[PDB]
Amino acid sequence: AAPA
Amino acid sequence: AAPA
Amino acid sequence: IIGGTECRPHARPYMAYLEIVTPENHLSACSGFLIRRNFVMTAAHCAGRSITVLLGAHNKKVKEDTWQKLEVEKQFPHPKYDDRLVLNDIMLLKLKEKANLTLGVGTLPISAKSNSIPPGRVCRAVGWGRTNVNEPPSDTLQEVKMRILDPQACKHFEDFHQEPQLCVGNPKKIRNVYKGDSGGPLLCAGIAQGIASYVLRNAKPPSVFTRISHYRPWINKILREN
Amino acid sequence: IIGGTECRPHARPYMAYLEIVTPENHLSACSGFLIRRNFVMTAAHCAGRSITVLLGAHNKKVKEDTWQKLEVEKQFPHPKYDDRLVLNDIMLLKLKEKANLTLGVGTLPISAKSNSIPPGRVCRAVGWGRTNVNEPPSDTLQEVKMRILDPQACKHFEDFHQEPQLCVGNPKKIRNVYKGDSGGPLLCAGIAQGIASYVLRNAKPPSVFTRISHYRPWINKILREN
């Protein structure tokens, strides 16, 4: 995952 | 008393 | 709108101009406001055989690219609307298709059972009605400041009820709403608190507005099921 | 926004473009929305040393009269925010000055604590993020439809929790949010229900959004005392  |  | 000022073009993109064909087949007009892409709120006495809504207009006699003319597919007059006493004069209108959001068309958040504004608060009435007793309906959207008054100020109105209606407009001034303003919104702090309902033929304020918060439950039900 | 469409100019006057100087001293950008004249809502992982707020814009590269660039006076990242797990990713920004609610700039109503959205509903994500994995951040504001999925569709995200978060985006489509969209709102019927939080690096949906209704009490407290 990656925080946008 | 007149409805607008 | 009597004694008010012209609104900034497109500054109140939820305003709706209604062209009505009354049940007795006469042609009339009212004001209203978009509360949802496919729902317009106005006064119940504005009901008729057919209705069309014009959104995105500032001057109704000047076509612009922001103009959106939609037909009403279903009229939602309040269940207990009382034609003769003019009670529960509120109506929701479902459009055939949803309106498209643009710089000239948006929605207006409405009051909730409580947020109701207290007496003394100065709000603004918005509509396309006559600018004076003997003057034509305004071509451009008009705005006017009006104060909420104690319900006693409306004692001369035989069927006024403080719970479902608001008494608005310093009687010592000319500032007021009038023919054609029905269905228009009464905004306080940018929140719709009421709907222009009825006036005195001589235009002497105050006028009577339907208290939105009082019908929130009914409004919500109709929106959920349509 | 991936697989979206360009928004109609100034059709969503509550959208805010945020330029951030991260704590690590890196320059970054996020999306956000105005919920009150001096309060913008966004993602907590967008917090930093300083933050600028641009309102009234459609194309961030084209200066217009509607442009209102405001400095952030105070940051209110959720007290329980967890950067590693990316939990409680929500923040409130108090502006140095109140924004002018004129043309191009307006507020966005948010969902009530018990007015949340159920799986199956189609909402719209809105942001300035990348139009794809290797594509640049869009100059113009974009929007795309995305369906709310059952929390089970997000079990591949080890730290996901259905209570405070939402699982959004049919996995068979490309429609989704991406880098730069964080803080943007997820709208359903004109009401902000979520906040873009995180996605899969390869942009394959669904994505995780913060469920606004769950933090309603915390949000109200901030807006109450500020």
Short mmCIF file of C-alpha atoms in Angstrom, two decimals:
data_model
loop_
_atom_site.label_atom_id
_atom_site.label_comp_id
_atom_site.label_asym_id
_atom_site.label_seq_id
_atom_site.Cartn_x
_atom_site.Cartn_y
_atom_site.Cartn_z
CA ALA A 1 0.00 0.00 0.00
CA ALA A 2 0.98 3.66 -0.31
CA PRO A 3 -0.56 6.75 1.36
CA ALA A 4 -1.76 9.19 -1.29
CA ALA B 1 -52.93 37.72 2.88
CA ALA B 2 -51.95 36.61 -0.59
CA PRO B 3 -49.82 33.55 -1.58
CA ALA B 4 -46.86 34.62 -3.69
CA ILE C 1 -37.99 41.33 -4.09
CA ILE C 2 -38.89 44.85 -2.97
CA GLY C 3 -36.20 47.34 -2.01
CA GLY C 4 -33.35 44.88 -2.41
CA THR C 5 -30.31 44.70 -4.66
CA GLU C 6 -29.25 42.76 -7.74
CA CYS C 7 -27.34 39.59 -6.87
CA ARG C 8 -23.85 39.05 -8.23
CA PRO C 9 -24.35 37.05 -11.44
CA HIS C 10 -24.11 33.34 -10.55
CA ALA C 11 -23.27 34.01 -6.89
CA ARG C 12 -26.32 31.94 -5.82
CA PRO C 13 -26.22 29.04 -8.39
CA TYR C 14 -29.03 27.10 -6.66
CA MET C 15 -31.72 29.61 -7.59
CA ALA C 16 -34.43 28.23 -9.82
CA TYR C 17 -36.93 30.10 -11.96
CA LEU C 18 -40.18 28.18 -12.36
CA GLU C 19 -42.62 28.62 -15.27
CA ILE C 20 -45.98 27.15 -14.39
CA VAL C 21 -49.18 26.24 -16.19
CA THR C 22 -51.72 26.40 -13.35
CA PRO C 23 -54.46 23.76 -12.98
CA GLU C 24 -56.96 26.30 -14.31
CA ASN C 25 -54.66 26.62 -17.31
CA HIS C 26 -53.17 30.05 -16.58
CA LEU C 27 -49.49 30.92 -16.97
CA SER C 28 -47.51 31.83 -13.87
CA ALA C 29 -44.04 31.99 -12.31
CA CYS C 30 -42.35 31.24 -8.97
CA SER C 31 -38.86 31.00 -7.51
CA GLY C 32 -37.18 27.98 -5.96
CA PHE C 33 -33.81 26.50 -5.14
CA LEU C 34 -31.94 23.33 -6.08
CA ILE C 35 -31.37 21.17 -3.00
CA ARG C 36 -30.20 18.10 -4.93
CA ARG C 37 -29.17 17.57 -8.55
CA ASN C 38 -32.68 16.34 -9.32
CA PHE C 39 -34.77 18.11 -6.66
CA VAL C 40 -36.08 21.64 -6.41
CA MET C 41 -37.81 23.01 -3.34
CA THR C 42 -40.53 25.62 -3.72
CA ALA C 43 -43.97 26.61 -2.38
CA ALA C 44 -46.94 24.25 -2.65
CA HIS C 45 -49.23 26.93 -4.07
CA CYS C 46 -46.94 26.97 -7.13
CA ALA C 47 -48.26 23.56 -8.24
CA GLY C 48 -49.94 23.09 -11.60
CA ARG C 49 -50.55 20.90 -14.62
CA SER C 50 -46.95 21.26 -15.76
CA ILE C 51 -43.79 22.97 -14.57
CA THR C 52 -40.34 23.65 -15.97
CA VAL C 53 -37.24 24.80 -14.12
CA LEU C 54 -34.56 27.19 -15.31
CA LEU C 55 -31.17 26.98 -13.57
CA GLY C 56 -27.95 28.92 -14.10
CA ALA C 57 -29.60 32.20 -14.99
CA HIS C 58 -28.89 35.63 -13.55
CA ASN C 59 -30.93 37.70 -15.98
CA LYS C 60 -33.83 35.56 -17.18
CA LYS C 61 -34.08 37.48 -20.48
CA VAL C 62 -30.43 36.86 -21.36
CA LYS C 63 -29.53 33.34 -22.44
CA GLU C 64 -26.13 32.10 -21.26
CA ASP C 65 -24.17 28.86 -21.61
CA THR C 66 -24.90 28.20 -17.94
CA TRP C 67 -28.63 27.88 -18.68
CA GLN C 68 -30.25 24.52 -17.96
CA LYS C 69 -33.98 24.12 -18.61
CA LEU C 70 -35.42 20.94 -17.13
CA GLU C 71 -38.95 19.58 -16.97
CA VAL C 72 -40.47 18.49 -13.68
CA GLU C 73 -41.51 14.86 -13.80
CA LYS C 74 -43.12 14.72 -10.39
CA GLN C 75 -44.62 17.25 -8.01
CA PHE C 76 -44.37 16.52 -4.28
CA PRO C 77 -46.84 18.95 -2.63
CA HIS C 78 -46.85 18.57 1.14
CA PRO C 79 -49.52 16.03 2.22
CA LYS C 80 -51.37 18.46 4.48
CA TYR C 81 -51.04 21.50 2.23
CA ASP C 82 -54.06 23.71 2.97
CA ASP C 83 -54.86 25.83 -0.06
CA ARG C 84 -57.32 28.16 1.72
CA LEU C 85 -55.37 28.81 4.96
CA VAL C 86 -52.05 28.54 3.15
CA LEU C 87 -50.56 26.10 5.64
CA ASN C 88 -47.80 23.60 4.93
CA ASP C 89 -47.02 25.57 1.78
CA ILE C 90 -43.91 23.66 0.79
CA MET C 91 -43.11 21.49 -2.19
CA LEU C 92 -40.37 19.29 -3.59
CA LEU C 93 -40.02 18.89 -7.36
CA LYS C 94 -38.32 15.92 -8.99
CA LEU C 95 -36.73 16.80 -12.34
CA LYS C 96 -36.78 14.36 -15.28
CA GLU C 97 -32.98 14.19 -15.17
CA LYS C 98 -30.29 15.37 -12.77
CA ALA C 99 -28.85 18.81 -13.33
CA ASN C 100 -25.16 19.08 -14.19
CA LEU C 101 -22.99 20.95 -11.69
CA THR C 102 -21.25 23.97 -13.21
CA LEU C 103 -20.06 27.41 -12.09
CA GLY C 104 -23.62 28.62 -12.53
CA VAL C 105 -25.53 25.71 -10.98
CA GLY C 106 -25.15 24.19 -7.50
CA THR C 107 -27.22 23.02 -4.52
CA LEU C 108 -28.26 24.66 -1.28
CA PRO C 109 -27.96 22.97 2.10
CA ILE C 110 -31.18 23.26 4.10
CA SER C 111 -31.90 23.81 7.80
CA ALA C 112 -32.15 20.90 10.22
CA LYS C 113 -34.70 20.43 13.02
CA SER C 114 -32.93 22.77 15.48
CA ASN C 115 -30.42 25.01 13.69
CA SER C 116 -33.50 27.19 13.20
CA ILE C 117 -32.45 30.85 13.44
CA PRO C 118 -33.67 32.95 16.45
CA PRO C 119 -35.60 36.27 16.29
CA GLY C 120 -33.48 39.32 15.59
CA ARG C 121 -31.27 37.48 13.12
CA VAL C 122 -31.02 39.31 9.80
CA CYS C 123 -31.37 36.96 6.84
CA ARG C 124 -31.65 37.39 3.08
CA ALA C 125 -34.59 36.60 0.81
CA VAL C 126 -33.86 35.70 -2.82
CA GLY C 127 -36.25 35.71 -5.77
CA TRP C 128 -37.38 36.81 -9.25
CA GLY C 129 -40.56 38.54 -8.10
CA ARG C 130 -41.90 42.04 -8.78
CA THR C 131 -39.64 44.87 -7.59
CA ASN C 132 -42.63 46.82 -6.31
CA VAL C 133 -46.41 46.59 -6.16
CA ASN C 134 -46.83 48.08 -9.65
CA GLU C 135 -43.49 47.04 -11.12
CA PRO C 136 -42.77 44.03 -13.37
CA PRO C 137 -41.07 40.83 -12.23
CA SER C 138 -37.33 41.50 -12.06
CA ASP C 139 -35.31 40.20 -15.02
CA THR C 140 -32.29 39.79 -12.80
CA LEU C 141 -32.07 37.82 -9.56
CA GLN C 142 -32.76 40.08 -6.58
CA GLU C 143 -31.65 39.89 -2.95
CA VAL C 144 -32.98 41.65 0.18
CA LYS C 145 -32.10 41.67 3.87
CA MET C 146 -34.92 40.91 6.32
CA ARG C 147 -35.11 40.27 10.06
CA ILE C 148 -36.85 37.40 11.81
CA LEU C 149 -39.53 38.86 14.08
CA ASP C 150 -41.38 37.65 17.15
CA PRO C 151 -44.41 35.64 15.95
CA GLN C 152 -46.63 38.30 17.50
CA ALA C 153 -45.63 40.71 14.74
CA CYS C 154 -47.74 38.51 12.46
CA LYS C 155 -50.88 38.54 14.61
CA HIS C 156 -52.83 40.31 11.87
CA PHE C 157 -52.43 37.13 9.84
CA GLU C 158 -55.43 35.00 10.83
CA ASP C 159 -53.78 31.62 10.23
CA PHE C 160 -50.16 32.24 11.19
CA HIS C 161 -48.56 29.56 13.37
CA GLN C 162 -45.16 30.16 14.95
CA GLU C 163 -44.16 26.51 14.85
CA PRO C 164 -44.40 25.81 11.10
CA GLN C 165 -44.01 29.41 9.91
CA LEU C 166 -41.71 32.39 10.27
CA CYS C 167 -42.71 36.04 10.57
CA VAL C 168 -40.20 38.09 8.59
CA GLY C 169 -39.63 41.75 7.76
CA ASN C 170 -39.53 44.98 9.76
CA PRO C 171 -43.01 46.48 9.14
CA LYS C 172 -41.46 49.96 9.27
CA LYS C 173 -39.55 49.32 6.04
CA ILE C 174 -40.35 48.64 2.40
CA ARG C 175 -37.86 45.75 2.22
CA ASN C 176 -39.99 42.69 1.47
CA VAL C 177 -40.73 39.78 -0.88
CA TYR C 178 -43.70 39.82 -3.28
CA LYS C 179 -45.54 38.30 -6.23
CA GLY C 180 -43.18 35.89 -7.96
CA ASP C 181 -40.94 35.37 -4.93
CA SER C 182 -42.93 32.44 -3.59
CA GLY C 183 -40.75 29.37 -3.31
CA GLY C 184 -37.70 31.57 -2.92
CA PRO C 185 -35.25 30.81 -0.10
CA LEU C 186 -34.69 32.83 3.06
CA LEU C 187 -30.99 32.34 3.89
CA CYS C 188 -29.34 32.99 7.23
CA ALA C 189 -25.56 32.60 7.28
CA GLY C 190 -25.76 30.80 3.94
CA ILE C 191 -28.21 28.19 5.18
CA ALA C 192 -31.77 27.98 3.86
CA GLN C 193 -34.06 28.58 6.84
CA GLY C 194 -37.31 29.31 5.03
CA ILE C 195 -39.43 29.49 1.91
CA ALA C 196 -41.31 32.62 0.84
CA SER C 197 -45.01 31.79 1.23
CA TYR C 198 -47.39 34.76 1.33
CA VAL C 199 -47.63 38.53 1.53
CA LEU C 200 -50.09 41.40 1.85
CA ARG C 201 -51.38 42.72 -1.47
CA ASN C 202 -50.22 46.19 -0.42
CA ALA C 203 -46.71 44.79 0.11
CA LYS C 204 -46.50 46.00 3.68
CA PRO C 205 -44.11 43.70 5.60
CA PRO C 206 -43.73 41.38 7.37
CA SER C 207 -44.37 38.39 5.12
CA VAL C 208 -44.83 34.72 5.95
CA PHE C 209 -42.22 32.05 5.27
CA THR C 210 -42.52 28.30 5.78
CA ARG C 211 -40.08 27.19 8.50
CA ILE C 212 -37.93 24.57 6.80
CA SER C 213 -36.62 22.91 9.97
CA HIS C 214 -40.21 22.06 10.89
CA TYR C 215 -40.55 19.83 7.83
CA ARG C 216 -37.06 18.32 7.74
CA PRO C 217 -38.46 14.83 8.48
CA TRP C 218 -40.89 15.00 5.55
CA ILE C 219 -38.22 16.44 3.27
CA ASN C 220 -35.81 13.64 4.17
CA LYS C 221 -38.40 10.95 3.54
CA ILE C 222 -39.22 12.21 0.04
CA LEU C 223 -35.51 12.47 -0.83
CA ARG C 224 -34.84 8.92 0.37
CA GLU C 225 -37.66 7.43 -1.69
CA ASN C 226 -37.06 9.43 -4.88
CA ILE D 1 -7.70 10.42 -10.46
CA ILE D 2 -7.47 7.40 -12.74
CA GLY D 3 -9.93 6.75 -15.54
CA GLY D 4 -11.78 9.93 -14.71
CA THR D 5 -13.01 12.98 -16.58
CA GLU D 6 -12.13 16.66 -16.26
CA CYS D 7 -14.52 18.51 -13.98
CA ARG D 8 -16.62 21.38 -15.26
CA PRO D 9 -14.80 24.65 -14.42
CA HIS D 10 -15.57 25.79 -10.88
CA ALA D 11 -18.38 23.26 -10.55
CA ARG D 12 -16.94 22.10 -7.20
CA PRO D 13 -15.88 25.40 -5.49
CA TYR D 14 -15.01 23.56 -2.27
CA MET D 15 -12.00 21.76 -3.75
CA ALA D 16 -8.64 22.80 -2.37
CA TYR D 17 -5.16 22.23 -3.76
CA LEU D 18 -2.57 21.86 -1.01
CA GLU D 19 1.13 22.54 -1.38
CA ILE D 20 3.08 20.95 1.46
CA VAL D 21 6.59 21.18 2.86
CA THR D 22 6.85 17.83 4.61
CA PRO D 23 8.54 17.37 8.01
CA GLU D 24 11.44 15.69 6.18
CA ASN D 25 11.60 18.99 4.28
CA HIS D 26 10.33 17.52 1.01
CA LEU D 27 7.97 19.44 -1.29
CA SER D 28 4.64 17.69 -1.85
CA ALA D 29 0.99 18.18 -2.81
CA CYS D 30 -2.43 16.89 -1.70
CA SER D 31 -6.12 17.56 -2.26
CA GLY D 32 -8.63 18.87 0.27
CA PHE D 33 -11.99 20.53 0.69
CA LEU D 34 -13.36 23.58 2.46
CA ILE D 35 -16.00 22.70 5.05
CA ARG D 36 -16.22 26.16 6.65
CA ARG D 37 -14.76 29.52 5.62
CA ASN D 38 -11.57 28.98 7.61
CA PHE D 39 -11.35 25.18 7.85
CA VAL D 40 -10.19 22.70 5.23
CA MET D 41 -10.47 18.93 5.61
CA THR D 42 -7.79 16.56 4.31
CA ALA D 43 -5.58 13.54 5.07
CA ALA D 44 -3.28 13.44 8.11
CA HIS D 45 -0.35 12.06 6.11
CA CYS D 46 -0.31 15.43 4.32
CA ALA D 47 0.77 17.25 7.48
CA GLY D 48 4.06 19.11 7.46
CA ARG D 49 6.22 22.09 8.33
CA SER D 50 3.99 24.48 6.43
CA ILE D 51 0.97 24.30 4.14
CA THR D 52 -0.64 26.55 1.55
CA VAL D 53 -4.25 26.36 0.44
CA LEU D 54 -5.38 27.29 -3.06
CA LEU D 55 -9.12 27.72 -3.58
CA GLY D 56 -11.17 28.77 -6.60
CA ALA D 57 -9.03 26.98 -9.15
CA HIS D 58 -9.78 24.50 -11.93
CA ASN D 59 -6.40 24.31 -13.66
CA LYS D 60 -3.63 24.81 -11.10
CA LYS D 61 -1.41 26.23 -13.85
CA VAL D 62 -3.83 28.95 -14.95
CA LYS D 63 -4.25 31.91 -12.61
CA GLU D 64 -7.81 33.22 -12.47
CA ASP D 65 -9.72 35.94 -10.61
CA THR D 66 -11.39 33.30 -8.49
CA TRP D 67 -8.02 32.23 -7.06
CA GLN D 68 -7.68 32.55 -3.29
CA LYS D 69 -4.38 31.33 -1.85
CA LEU D 70 -4.44 31.08 1.96
CA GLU D 71 -1.83 30.10 4.51
CA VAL D 72 -2.66 27.46 7.10
CA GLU D 73 -2.73 28.87 10.62
CA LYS D 74 -3.05 25.56 12.45
CA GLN D 75 -2.97 21.85 11.67
CA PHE D 76 -5.28 19.42 13.45
CA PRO D 77 -4.16 15.92 12.45
CA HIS D 78 -6.22 13.30 14.26
CA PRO D 79 -4.64 12.63 17.71
CA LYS D 80 -4.69 8.88 17.04
CA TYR D 81 -3.19 9.08 13.56
CA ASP D 82 -0.69 6.27 12.96
CA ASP D 83 1.77 6.80 10.08
CA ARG D 84 2.94 3.18 9.91
CA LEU D 85 -0.55 1.66 9.79
CA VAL D 86 -2.03 4.77 8.17
CA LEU D 87 -4.96 4.65 10.58
CA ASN D 88 -7.07 7.66 11.61
CA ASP D 89 -5.76 9.47 8.52
CA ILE D 90 -7.82 12.66 8.69
CA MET D 91 -6.93 16.26 9.42
CA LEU D 92 -8.49 19.69 9.85
CA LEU D 93 -6.66 22.83 8.78
CA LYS D 94 -7.54 26.20 10.26
CA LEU D 95 -6.81 29.01 7.79
CA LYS D 96 -5.00 32.25 8.70
CA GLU D 97 -7.90 34.17 7.20
CA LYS D 98 -11.46 33.26 6.31
CA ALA D 99 -12.00 32.42 2.65
CA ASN D 100 -14.51 34.55 0.75
CA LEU D 101 -17.56 32.56 -0.26
CA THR D 102 -17.84 34.31 -3.60
CA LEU D 103 -17.77 32.79 -7.09
CA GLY D 104 -15.42 29.85 -7.43
CA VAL D 105 -15.28 29.20 -3.69
CA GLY D 106 -17.82 27.52 -1.42
CA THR D 107 -18.09 24.94 1.38
CA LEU D 108 -18.97 21.26 1.33
CA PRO D 109 -21.40 19.65 3.77
CA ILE D 110 -20.09 16.49 5.41
CA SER D 111 -21.89 13.32 6.50
CA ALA D 112 -23.57 12.94 9.89
CA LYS D 113 -22.38 10.35 12.42
CA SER D 114 -25.29 8.07 11.49
CA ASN D 115 -25.80 9.11 7.86
CA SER D 116 -22.95 7.02 6.44
CA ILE D 117 -22.97 5.21 3.07
CA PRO D 118 -23.83 1.47 2.50
CA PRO D 119 -21.94 -0.91 0.18
CA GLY D 120 -23.25 -0.85 -3.37
CA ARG D 121 -23.65 2.94 -3.63
CA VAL D 122 -21.80 4.77 -6.40
CA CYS D 123 -19.92 7.90 -5.31
CA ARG D 124 -17.44 10.30 -6.94
CA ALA D 125 -13.81 10.85 -5.97
CA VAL D 126 -12.33 14.28 -6.76
CA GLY D 127 -8.69 15.29 -6.73
CA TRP D 128 -5.62 16.71 -8.45
CA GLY D 129 -3.57 13.53 -8.34
CA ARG D 130 -1.91 11.55 -11.12
CA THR D 131 -4.06 10.34 -14.00
CA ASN D 132 -2.12 7.08 -13.86
CA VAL D 133 0.85 5.29 -12.29
CA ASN D 134 3.55 6.96 -14.38
CA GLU D 135 1.53 9.95 -15.51
CA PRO D 136 1.87 13.39 -13.97
CA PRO D 137 -0.50 15.07 -11.49
CA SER D 138 -3.37 16.54 -13.51
CA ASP D 139 -3.33 20.33 -14.03
CA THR D 140 -7.11 20.31 -14.10
CA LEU D 141 -9.45 19.04 -11.41
CA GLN D 142 -10.69 15.51 -12.18
CA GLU D 143 -13.54 13.30 -10.99
CA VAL D 144 -14.41 9.62 -11.34
CA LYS D 145 -17.22 7.30 -10.26
CA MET D 146 -16.33 4.56 -7.76
CA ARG D 147 -18.52 2.03 -6.00
CA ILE D 148 -18.50 1.36 -2.27
CA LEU D 149 -17.50 -2.27 -1.72
CA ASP D 150 -18.06 -4.63 1.20
CA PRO D 151 -15.18 -4.40 3.70
CA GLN D 152 -14.15 -7.93 2.65
CA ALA D 153 -12.88 -6.64 -0.69
CA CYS D 154 -10.12 -4.89 1.30
CA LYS D 155 -8.90 -7.81 3.40
CA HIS D 156 -5.62 -7.74 1.46
CA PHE D 157 -4.78 -4.53 3.34
CA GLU D 158 -3.61 -5.94 6.68
CA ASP D 159 -4.39 -2.75 8.62
CA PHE D 160 -7.84 -1.99 7.18
CA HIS D 161 -10.83 -1.61 9.52
CA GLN D 162 -14.40 -1.31 8.24
CA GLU D 163 -15.43 0.86 11.17
CA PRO D 164 -13.26 3.91 10.47
CA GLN D 165 -12.51 3.19 6.80
CA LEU D 166 -14.26 2.50 3.49
CA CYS D 167 -13.37 0.02 0.75
CA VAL D 168 -13.86 1.79 -2.59
CA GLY D 169 -13.54 0.84 -6.25
CA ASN D 170 -14.64 -2.17 -8.28
CA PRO D 171 -11.42 -4.18 -8.83
CA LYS D 172 -12.37 -5.06 -12.42
CA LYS D 173 -12.12 -1.42 -13.51
CA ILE D 174 -9.23 1.05 -13.65
CA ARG D 175 -11.23 3.89 -12.08
CA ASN D 176 -9.52 4.89 -8.87
CA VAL D 177 -7.64 7.56 -6.93
CA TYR D 178 -3.83 7.72 -6.74
CA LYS D 179 -0.81 9.74 -5.60
CA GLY D 180 -1.86 13.35 -5.07
CA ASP D 181 -5.54 12.59 -4.47
CA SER D 182 -5.22 12.11 -0.71
CA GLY D 183 -7.44 14.46 1.27
CA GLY D 184 -9.87 14.67 -1.61
CA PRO D 185 -13.52 13.96 -0.80
CA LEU D 186 -15.62 10.95 -1.76
CA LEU D 187 -19.07 12.30 -2.58
CA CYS D 188 -22.42 10.58 -2.68
CA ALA D 189 -25.41 12.83 -3.39
CA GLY D 190 -23.35 15.98 -2.88
CA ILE D 191 -22.18 15.02 0.62
CA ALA D 192 -18.60 14.19 1.58
CA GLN D 193 -18.59 10.64 2.97
CA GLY D 194 -14.91 9.77 2.78
CA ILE D 195 -11.38 11.06 2.33
CA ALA D 196 -8.91 9.41 -0.07
CA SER D 197 -6.23 7.84 2.10
CA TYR D 198 -4.14 5.14 0.46
CA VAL D 199 -3.96 2.94 -2.61
CA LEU D 200 -2.05 0.05 -4.12
CA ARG D 201 1.21 1.14 -5.81
CA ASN D 202 0.16 -0.42 -9.12
CA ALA D 203 -3.11 1.54 -8.93
CA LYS D 204 -5.30 -1.55 -8.91
CA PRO D 205 -8.50 -0.78 -6.96
CA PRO D 206 -10.12 -0.85 -4.54
CA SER D 207 -8.67 1.92 -2.37
CA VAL D 208 -9.09 2.99 1.25
CA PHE D 209 -10.94 6.10 2.33
CA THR D 210 -11.41 7.54 5.78
CA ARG D 211 -15.07 7.24 6.80
CA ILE D 212 -15.99 10.78 7.83
CA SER D 213 -19.11 9.87 9.86
CA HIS D 214 -16.96 7.87 12.31
CA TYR D 215 -15.03 11.00 13.24
CA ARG D 216 -17.98 13.36 13.31
CA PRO D 217 -17.74 13.88 17.09
CA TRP D 218 -14.02 14.72 16.91
CA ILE D 219 -14.57 17.03 13.96
CA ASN D 220 -17.40 18.85 15.71
CA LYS D 221 -15.26 19.45 18.78
CA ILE D 222 -12.51 21.08 16.72
CA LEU D 223 -14.94 23.30 14.80
CA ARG D 224 -16.71 24.10 18.09
CA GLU D 225 -13.66 25.34 19.99
CA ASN D 226 -12.02 26.95 16.95
#
